[PDB]
């Protein structure tokens with residue numbers, strides 16, 4: 475049923491399902507088997523930052539992930555998102571753990587979307603920026619194990635009081651309002667997403683990752699989408 479486009483920060487290589495032999499970024503059209511990837515030098519415990527972009531002229535989805543003091547990693551993939559995704563969509567952040575685990579912690583998240591038409595002065599827009607997550611955050615649809623307000627943060631995966639991550643966990647956060655990505659009289663459509671995070675683990679091998687995703691508006695966590703499926707897909711096809 476559900477329909478997914480996402481940019482994965484895969485902290486654990488499941489090389490039997492096409493993950494490279496290390497931590498990587500990647501771009502998932504309707505399949506966790508990333509159509510493109512590139513190497514990611516994840517840093518256990520540092521605050522990393524993620525920049526997603528597309529426009530309907532270039533029909534290319536490109537992302538850049540960047541720790542301070544450090545080189546960025548970038549990946550891109552040419553796709554017409556209008557030939558993939560429904561005309562109305564919800565955007566979100568997903569992450570997960572299996573028998574390996576990490577903190578999956580959003581410190582900030584900031585979407586922008588524009589439709590500009592043939593007409594004079596006719597942009598249509600939605601921005602949001604969260605630098606501080608509330609306990610009762612009514613503009614976010616929290617799903618599965620995702621919680622807010624903990625040091626004013628979004629906790630995609632489960633954490634215990636003391637402050638360390640639980641395995642076999644999946645959670646997502648979706649912005650309450652739909653996003654129009656296409657309109658008949660569109661001449662350029664665009665979107666960018668930024669978000670910062672703190673993946674952290676007591677282990678040399680953390681799993682599984684964080685995705686920023688764009689989905690149908692009724693999208694929900696598919697069964698057994700813990701671990702390698704990142705809360706996005708029900709299987710690995």
Ligand SMILES: O=c1[nH]cc(F)c(=O)[nH]1
Pocket residue numbers: 587588589598599600651652653654655
């Ligand atoms: O891309 C968008 N344009 C206008 C809107 F109101 C919205 O939610 N999304």
Ligand SMILES: [Ca+2]
Pocket residue numbers: 484485486487488493682683702
């Ligand atoms: Ca993986």
Ligand SMILES: [Mn+2]
Pocket residue numbers: 482484492493494498500506507508511
């Ligand atoms: Mn991958």
